[PDB]
């Protein structure tokens, strides 16, 4: 039974990136997936993507730029306080010079740098680098 569309999507992206493919198809698309991909694109780790509509959950087609090392989900969505954000980033990200921790906060889905700028905690969604 499927229980994490984001986990499936990120696994598919990772596999396609490893194989060196130029496009990847993501099944059950969702708002969370779209926001995650938007953050990745804004930081330049993927190209453009299209949301194919089929009167159902829909699909996505993402253009891979051959620049992403790993995009992983963190389950369960543990609550991250602004005080332990530093510990979580040090643990999960390869370096302090690159890589992003994606959180969902009351403001919205963003990366850990923007969350620290706005002094927001929240539940962790995943990370990419």
């Amino acid at each position: 039974v499927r229980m994490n569309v984001l986990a499936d999507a990120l696994n598919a992206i990772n596999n396609a990136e490893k194989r060196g493919k130029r496009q990847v198809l993501i099944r059950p698309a969702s708002k969370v997936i779209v926001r995650f991909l938007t953050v990745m694109m804004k930081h330049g780790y993927i190209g453009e993507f299209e949301i194919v509509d089929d009167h159902r959950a829909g699909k996505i087609v993402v253009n891979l730029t051959g620049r992403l090392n790993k995009a992983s989900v963190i389950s369960p969505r543990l609550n991250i306080r602004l005080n332990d954000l530093e510990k979580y980033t040090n643990t999960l990200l390869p370096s302090r010079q690159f890589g992003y921790l994606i959180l969902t906060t009351s403001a919205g889905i963003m990366d850990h740098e923007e969350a620290r700028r706005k002094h927001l905690g929240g539940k962790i969604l995943g990370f990419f680098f």
Binding site: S75, P76, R77, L78
Partner: protein
């Protein structure tokens, strides 16, 4: 795989406790019969009375007769076998002597080629065995 849900704290904690008992160290330190089984009753040393002097054949490939002594502990009256270290030190130990006994070093396990001996002598007649061996002190 282990549970990963956000509300599985009870399962994780209970499973950890259940499996800690399959750990030799944890079980040895929490079984409950430690005091009644350990001859020293959880102490480091114990005073006892020498009953006889015995010789223990060293394990293979070594060959020798280790000079041990049978002791009865005062605190509980349990019988143990203790090693008399150093050379010719069995002479200092007479029968019906009050000896201080300590562990052999491996926390209740045999040491070296001596089989089944887990204790050694530290003092005889309130005198240090090392002092007697070195000649610092003499038999009371």
């Amino acid at each position: 795989g282990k549970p990963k849900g956000l509300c599985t704290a009870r399962k994780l904690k209970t499973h950890r406790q259940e499996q800690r008992w399959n750990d030799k160290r944890y079980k040895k330190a929490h079984i409950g019969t430690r005091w009644k089984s350990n001859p020293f009753g959880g102490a480091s040393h114990a005073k006892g009375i020498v009953l006889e002097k015995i010789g223990v054949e060293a394990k293979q490939p070594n060959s020798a007769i280790r000079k041990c002594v049978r002791v009865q502990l005062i605190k509980n009256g349990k019988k143990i076998t203790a090693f008399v270290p150093n050379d010719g030190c069995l002479n200092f130990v007479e029968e019906n002597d009050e000896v201080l006994v300590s562990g052999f070093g491996r926390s209740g396990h045999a040491v070296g080629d001596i089989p089944g001996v887990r204790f050694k002598i530290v003092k005889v007649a309130n005198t240090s065995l090392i002092a007697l061996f070195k000649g610092k002190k003499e038999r009371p």
